[PDB]
Amino acid sequence: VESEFSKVLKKHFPGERFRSSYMKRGGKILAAQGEEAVVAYLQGKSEEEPPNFQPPAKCHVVTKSRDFAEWPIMKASEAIQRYIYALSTTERAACKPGKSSESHAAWFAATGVSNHGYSHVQGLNLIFDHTLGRYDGVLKKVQLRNEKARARLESINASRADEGLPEIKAEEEEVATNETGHLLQPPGINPSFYVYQTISPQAYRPRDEIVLPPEYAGYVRDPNAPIPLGVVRNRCDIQKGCPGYIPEWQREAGTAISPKTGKAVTVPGLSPKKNKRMRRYWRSEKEKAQDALLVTVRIGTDWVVIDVRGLLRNARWRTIAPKDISLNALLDLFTGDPVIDVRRNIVTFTYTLDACGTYARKWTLKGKQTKATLDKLTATQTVALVAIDLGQTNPISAGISRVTQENGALQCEPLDRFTLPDDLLKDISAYRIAWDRNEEELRARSVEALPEAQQAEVRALDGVSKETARTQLCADFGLDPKRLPWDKMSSNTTFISEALLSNSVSRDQVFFTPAPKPVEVMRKDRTWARAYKPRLSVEAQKLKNEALWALKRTSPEYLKLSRRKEELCRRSINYVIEKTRRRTQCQIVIPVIEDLNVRFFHGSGKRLPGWDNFFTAKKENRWFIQGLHKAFSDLRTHRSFYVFEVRPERTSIDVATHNLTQVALTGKT
RNA sequence: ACGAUUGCCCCUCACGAGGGGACAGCUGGUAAUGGGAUACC
DNA sequence: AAGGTATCCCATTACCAGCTTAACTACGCG
DNA sequence: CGCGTAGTTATCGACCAT
Numbered sequence: 001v002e003s004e005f006s007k008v009l010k011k012h013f014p015g016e017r018f019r020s021s022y023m024k025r026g027g028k029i030l031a032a033q034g035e036e037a038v039v040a041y042l043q044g045k046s047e048e049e050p051p052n053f054q055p056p057a058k059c060h061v062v063t064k065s066r067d068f069a070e071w072p073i074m075k076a077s078e079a080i081q082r083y084i085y086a087l088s089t090t091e092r093a094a095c096k097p098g099k100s101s102e103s104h105a106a107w108f109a110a111t112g113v114s115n116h117g118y119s120h121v122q123g124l125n126l127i128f129d130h131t132l133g134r135y136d137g138v139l140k141k142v143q144l145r146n147e148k149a150r151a152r153l154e155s156i157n158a159s160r161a162d163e164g165l166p167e168i169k170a171e172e173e174e175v176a177t178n179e180t181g182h183l184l185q186p187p188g189i190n191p192s193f194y195v196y197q198t199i200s201p202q203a204y205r206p207r208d209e210i211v212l213p214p215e216y217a218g219y220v221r222d223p224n225a226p227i228p229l230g231v232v233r234n235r236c237d238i239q240k241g242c243p244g245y246i247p248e249w250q251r252e253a254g255t256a257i258s259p260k261t262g263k264a265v266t267v268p269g270l271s272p273k274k275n276k277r278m279r280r281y282w283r284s285e286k287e288k289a290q291d292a293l294l295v296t297v298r299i300g301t302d303w304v305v306i307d308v309r310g311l312l313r314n315a316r317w318r319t320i321a322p323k324d325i326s327l328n329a330l331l332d333l334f335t336g337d338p339v340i341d342v343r344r345n346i347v348t349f350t351y352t353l354d355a356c357g358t359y360a361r362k363w364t365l366k367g368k369q370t371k372a373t374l375d376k377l378t379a380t381q382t383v384a385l386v387a388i389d390l391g392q393t394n395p396i397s398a399g400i401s402r403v404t405q406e407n408g409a410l411q412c413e414p415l416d417r418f419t420l421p422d423d424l425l426k427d428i429s430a431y432r433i434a435w436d437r438n439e440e441e442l443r444a445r446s447v448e449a450l451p452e453a454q455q456a457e458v459r460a461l462d463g464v465s466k467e468t469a470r471t472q473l474c475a476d477f478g479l480d481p482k483r484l485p486w487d488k489m490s491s492n493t494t495f496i497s498e499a500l501l502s503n504s505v506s507r508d509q510v511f512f513t514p515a516p517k518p519v520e521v522m523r524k525d526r527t528w529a530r531a532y533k534p535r536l537s538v539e540a541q542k543l544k545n546e547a548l549w550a551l552k553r554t555s556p557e558y559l560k561l562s563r564r565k566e567e568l569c570r571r572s573i574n575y576v577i578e579k580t581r582r583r584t585q586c587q588i589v590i591p592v593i594e595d596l597n598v599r600f601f602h603g604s605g606k607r608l609p610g611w612d613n614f615f616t617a618k619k620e621n622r623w624f625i626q627g628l629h630k631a632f633s634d635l636r637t638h639r640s641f642y643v644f645e646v647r648p649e650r651t652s653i654d655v656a657t658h659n660l661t662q663v664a665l666t667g668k669t
Numbered sequence: 670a671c672g673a674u675u676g677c678c679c680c681u682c683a684c685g686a687g688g689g690g691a692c693a694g695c696u697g698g699u700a701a702u703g704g705g706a707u708a709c710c
Numbered sequence: 711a712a713g714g715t716a717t718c719c720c721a722t723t724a725c726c727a728g729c730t731t732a733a734c735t736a737c738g739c740g
Numbered sequence: 741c742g743c744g745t746a747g748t749t750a751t752c753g754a755c756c757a758t
Contacts, residue, residue, distance in 0.1 A: 006751090006753085010753090020752065021731080021732080022751095023752065024751055025733075027751060028734090028750045030750090031750070052752095054730070056693050056730075057694095060676065100748075101746090121746075121748080134698095136728090137726090137728045137729095138727065140727065141728095142727095155758075185698055186697095186698080188698070190729080194729080194730075196731080196732095197731070197733095197746095198747090229674085230673085230674045231672080233671065240685080243686095245686080246686065247686070250685090250687055256683090258682075258683045260683060265682070266681080267681080267682085267688085268681095268687075271688060275672080276688095278672070281685090291675090307675065308675090309674055309675035310676060312675085317673070318692095323673085337730070337731060339696095341696090348693095348730070350693090360693095362755080364755090365756085366755075366757080367755085427690095442720095492711080513710080513713095514710090514715095515710065515713080516714080517714055517715075535706095535707085536706095538707085541706070545705080545719070548720080549719055555720095555721095558720090558721055560677090561678095562721085562722060562723085563677070564679070566691075567690065567692085568678090568679090570691055598723090599725095600702095602702050604712085618705090638692090638693060645756085647757090
C-alpha cells in the first residue's frame with residue numbers, strides 16, 4: 001500500500017534515498033509539523049549511498065534468574081507464534097492485532113490465546129510483526145518463485161516464437177496453501193529473545209534480587225569511569241609468581257632446545273604488530289570474574305546478566321572505540337536491542353549505524369551490468385580488477401589488472417598473475433588430515449563402546465579383513481595371488497576379470513547387466529572386494545553403528561572443522577584482497593569471479609588405488625570451490641565490495657583469468 | 670624499546686605462555702552434496 | 711566415463727523467506 | 741521533582757540470463 005510520505009519524497013527528492021533513521025524521524029516531523037516542515041529537514045542531510053548494514057557482535061550470558069523457557073515473554077512468544085502459523089489464509093487476512101496496548105488485549109481475548117502475564121506494547125509488536133512476517137514470507141517465497149518461473153519461460157518463449165518450433169504453451173502455478181486454505185510446510189517457531197527499548201541492556205548496578213555466582217562476590221564498576229587497559233606495555237616485566245609471565249627464552253626470536261626433552265623448536269618472539277590482540281591471564285577464576293563487563297537485562301521479576309568483554313574485543317578490533325572508554329560509552333556504540341540466543345546462551349549485539357555503518361550491495365553484478373558499472377567507477381579514478389578462477393588442483397589462481405578508462409573505451413593493463421602461497425596450501429592439507437584423523441578417532445572410539453565379546457569380534461575381523469577377502473577370493477576361483485598385481489587396483493580397473501578370463505572358467509559370474517540408472521560390462525575389482533569383504537554379524541553391526549551414530553551426534557569436532565574450513569576460506573580471500581591492494585596501490589579493488597553454479601562444484605572423497613585401500617574409508621578430498629565462491633559473494637556485503645559474476649565463454653586468448661577479465665570489460669558473453 | 674581483558678579456529682610449548690587466523694550472524698522451511706553400513710540384480 | 715538401485719544413519723553446505731530501533735511522551739511513587 | 745517503568749508512533753525504492 002502506497003504511503004503519503006512516499007508521495008512527498010518522490011515529489012521533492014527523486015533520487016536522494018536516505019537511511020532508515022532519517023526516514024523514521026522525517027515521517028514523525030511530517031505527521032506532526034505539517035507537510036512543509038519535512039522538506040526543510042531532509043534538504044540538508046542526504047547520502048549518496050546510505051549505510052544499510054550493521055555488523056554483529058556476540059557476548060556471553062553469565063547467569064539468569066531461571067531458564068529462558070520459563071520466562072513469560074518466551075512463553076507468550078511461543079504461544080502467539082504456534083497459533084498464527086496454524087491459521088489459514090482467510091483467517092490471517094482478518095487477524096489484525098493493533099500496535100496499541102488496547103488492541104493487544106482485544107486480540108488476546110478475541111482469539112483465546114493467552115499471554116502468560118506479559119504485556120509490553122513494544123515487545124509484543126516485535127513478536128507480532130516477526131510472526132506475521134514469517135507467515136507472509138512462506139507465502140511470498142512461493143509466489144515469487146511462480147512469477148520467476150513464468151517470466152523465464154515467457155522470455156525464452158520469445159526466442160522460441162521468433163525462430164523456434166511449436167513452443168511450450170504454459171506451466172502450472174505452484175501453490176503454498178492446502179485444499180482447506182491452511183498452510184502446508186509452515187515455518188517453525190524461532191526461540192529468539194528480541195530485546196527492545198524498555199528492556200535494553202544497561203550497566204550492572206547491584207540490586208539484591210540479582211544474585212551472581214560465587215566468583216563475582218564483590219562486583220563494583222562505575223559505569224561512567226574509563227575501564228583500564230589490562231596488560232603492562234612490555235609483558236616481560238611480570239615476575240615469576242604473577243600470572244601472564246613471559247619466560248626469558250620466549251622473548252628473543254630464534255631456535256633452541258628444551259631442558260626436559262631435546263627438540264629444535266622455533267620461537268618467533270613477541271609479535272612486532274601494532275593492532276595485535278592482547279591475551280590476559282588471571283591468577284584465579286575469581287580475578288577473571290572481577291575484570292568482566294557486566295550488564296543486565298530486566299523484563300520483570302526475572303533478569304539476566306551478560307558479560308560484555310565480547311563487545312569490547314569486537315569494538316577494539318574495528319578500532320571504533322577510543323583507548324579510554326566507559327561501559328556506558330561501549331553500550332552506546334551498539335543498538336539497544338540485542339538478540340539473545342536462548343538455546344545457546346549467546347547474545348548478539350549490533351553496531352549503531354554511526355559506530356560502524358557501511359553500504360551492503362544486495363546482489364553481485366553480472367551480465368551487462370559490469371561494463372556500465374565500470375563506466376561509472378572509472379570516470380574519475382582507476383579501479384583494480386582482480387580476476388579469480390577456482391579449481392581443485394590450484395584452489396585460487398588470480399590475475400590482477402587495473403582497468404583505466406580512455407575516452408569512450410575501457411583499457412585493461414594486465415598487471416600480475418599469482419596463486420595463493422604454500423602456507424595456505426599447507427593449511428588446506430592439514431584441514432583434510434584433521435578431518436581424516438577425526439573420522440578415524442570417532443571410528444576407533446565407537447569400537448570401545450561395544451561389550452568385550454563383540455568388541456573382540458569386530459577388532460579381529462577389521463584386522464584381517466583384507467587378507468581374508470584376498471585368500472577367500474583366490475581359493476574360490478583358483479587364481480594365484482602372486483600372478484595378479486595387487487597395488488595397481490583402481491575404482492574401474494578390471495584386473496581380477498582378466499585373470500578370471502585367462503583361466504576362462506565361465507563368463508556368467510563376471511559380466512553383468514547394469515540396471516539403467518543394456519550394455520554388458522565385466523564386473524570391476526572394487527565390486528569384487530565389496531562382495532568378498534567379510535561382513536560382521538548383523539547384531540554386532542547394529543550395535544557398532546548405533547554407537548557411532550551416538551558419538552557423531554554429540555561430537556564437538558564437526559563444528560570445529562566446519563568453522564576451520566570457513567575461516568580458511570575467508571583467510572584465503574583476504575590474502576588475495578590484501579595482495580591486490582598492496583600491489584595495485586589503489587583504493588578500489590573489485591574481484592571478478594566466475595558465475596559457477598556451486599551445486600555441481602562439490603568435490604568427492606578419494607582413496608589411493610590399491611587392494612589394501614578398498615576396505616579403508618575414503619580420504620576426504622572435497623573442493624573449496626563452494627567455500628571461496630561464498631566468501632567472495634560475502635565480500636560484497638560485509639565490506640561493500642563490488643563483485644562480478646561473469647560467464648567465462650571459452651576462447652584461445654593465464655587463459656582462465658584473461659577470459660574472466662575479457663567478459664567483464666564488456667557485457668556481451 | 671613498543672601494543673586490544675572474555676570467547677572462537679589453527680600451530681608451538683621449558684605448562685609460565687607464545688605466534689597466526691575469522692569476525693555478518695541468527696533463526697525457519699525445503700533441496701542437494703559428502704561419507705558410512707546393509708540388501709539385491 | 712564412480713554398475714546401478716533401494717532402505718537407513720551422520721555431517722556439512724545452498725537457496726530463499728523472516729529478523730537483527732529509538733525519540734518523545736505519560737504516569738506512579740518515594 | 742526525579743526516577744523507574746512503560747505506551748505512541750514513525751519507514752522501509754527491489755539485478756543478468758536462460
